Design a binder for this molecule. Structure first.
Ligand SMILES: CC(=O)Cc1cc[n+]([C@@H]2O[C@H](COP(=O)([O-])OP(=O)(O)OC[C@H]3O[C@@H](n4cnc5c(N)ncnc54)[C@H](O)[C@@H]3O)[C@@H](O)[C@H]2O)cc1C(N)=O
Ligand SMILES: CC(=O)Cc1cc[n+]([C@@H]2O[C@H](COP(=O)([O-])OP(=O)(O)OC[C@H]3O[C@@H](n4cnc5c(N)ncnc54)[C@H](O)[C@@H]3O)[C@@H](O)[C@H]2O)cc1C(N)=O
Lengths: 254, 254
């Protein structure tokens, strides 16, 4: 798909992977780039606006742990201005297995709730135009980092949820694919809590293995968006972009 | 493992799969069988007690959506009386993708919290004896029923979470394995809501394919418990018991 003149909403665009993805995205001559993020970052906004003055960049404070009704309210405001939105990127994520409930609320529930809210505007059953959802999941949704079992389980959830969304496309009009980075040097992984501190040095041990930069990650992210393959499960690991095949262990037949 | 004179806690023992599993379990001459479930069923209780009068059967009202501190409170009493608990079975589950938050809270968060609570009594790092966790996940954790994407993603999370538990056993002393039933004729699947009603006939379509009874499921469940294989991923589908191999797509190296 061609990003020229598209309207994009990116939830959690100002994080480490987000920001480097965002720098590449706004190079593509979007019409509108809507950033939804919990925490203002004024420096990153100015930087992004610097790169490509043609793009209209707007920022709205958004916490993905709000109720679906609050998401719908905010999204109505955005559709009211923009009329159409082509792509939603769900990128919010924390890594701290001391915060069990909060990990699941942000990494899993909130992504489902934002998706659920936007379907109100996109669902072809309601007359909507359909749309495209890019979900930032994680290779730990494939195979856990088992010293952070909660984080990894929340990401296994959103890989599954994204697979299912992609299979609902003929009914809803909304296609979907997951973006699953391998270990990427950002503030997320520099220091973090393991579950019941089974491994207090998890961050040190993790970064003694090969990693990628957020710029490598960001570059491959935009390529996967431009590939626009419904149901792809993209692995972005050590600077490459690869589609994995999900194992069929069981089939519901429906 | 030999179940004779074992002490078992079974969360959600009085449901469709639970009850048929429980009938087999109490045949094995447990010392103590502790049922935790959201509501008492004196019919089922009296039945179970009838089958094997040697087993001491106790019931406590438990909702898995309470905070960890409440779980610990309840567990502390149980450990104090029984002194040792050999096996915990987490089986609570709902199926209703109109209740997004509630699905996640019961199917995923609640299982994590019960597990987190009991580790206080079992963790070998704290002087505990270690222990055995059997988690009821679902084949939809392998491959979704995509008309109930939230239910299925919640079960993908607990499969992942169970795999990670099993890999933490050398540190915690607590082994674990998942029990993943295929479609099993119980009140769970007779009628249920799909997500945004993408498929209002999901139950009808599902039960037009081969199923298994809860008695078949129940028999194979006790065999898997007797197999006692840490890290097993057990599929209980169409009356068989099979261990699946999880695909290694990615490795954390730690
Ligand atoms: C460890 C791992 O998962 C491997 C890899 C894959 C996935 N991820 C994921 O990629 C995404 C971005 O992570 P990062 O490395 O950029 O981390 P980061 O902490 O720099 O970025 C976090 C982003 O999520 C947003 N966010 C957090 N809580 C929010 C809330 N309640 N509402 C709205 N936004 C919220 C922040 O405001 C910020 O924009 C996350 O979803 C994360 O889980 C990270 C990596 C990595 N850094 O190596
Ligand atoms: C549908 C599917 O995923 C295939 C299969 C695999 C796994 N499962 C899982 O098996 C387990 C039992 O399902 P079932 O079919 O016996 O359903 P059921 O409705 O008869 O039983 C639900 C059990 O969970 C308990 N429970 C629910 N909410 C609770 C709460 N808040 N606190 C404490 N306990 C609570 C109930 O009280 C009951 O004991 C669930 O984890 C379920 O998701 C069912 C099937 C099946 N029935 O075909």
């Amino acid at each position: 798909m061609d990003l020229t003149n598209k309207n994009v909403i990116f939830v959690a665009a100002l994080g480490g992977i987000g920001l480097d993805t965002s720098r590449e995205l706004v190079k593509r001559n979007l019409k509108n780039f809507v950033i939804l993020d919990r925490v203002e970052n004024p420096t990153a906004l100015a930087e992004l606006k610097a790169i490509n003055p043609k793009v209209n960049i707007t920022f709205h404070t958004y916490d993905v742990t709000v109720p679906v009704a609050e998401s719908k309210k905010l999204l109505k405001k955005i559709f009211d201005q923009l009329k159409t939105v082509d792509i939603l990127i769900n990128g919010a994520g924390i890594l701290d297995d001391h915060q069990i409930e909060r990990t699941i609320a942000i990494n899993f529930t909130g992504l489902v709730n934002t998706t659920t809210a936007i379907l109100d505007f996109w669902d072809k059953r309601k007359g909507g135009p359909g749309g495209i959802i890019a979900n930032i999941c994680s290779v730990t949704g494939f195979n856990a980092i088992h010293q952070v079992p909660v984080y990894s389980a929340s990401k296994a959830a959103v890989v599954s949820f994204t697979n299912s969304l992609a299979k609902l496309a003929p009914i809803t009009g909304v296609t979907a694919y997951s973006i699953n980075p391998g270990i990427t040097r950002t503030p997320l992984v520099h220091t973090f809590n393991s579950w019941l501190d089974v491994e207090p040095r998890v961050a040190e041990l993790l970064l003694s293995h090969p990693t990628q930069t957020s710029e490598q990650c960001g570059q491959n992210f935009v390529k996967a968006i431009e590939a626009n393959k419904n149901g792809a499960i993209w692995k972005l690991d050590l600077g490459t972009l690869e589609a994995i095949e999900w194992t069929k262990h069981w089939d519901s037949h429906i």
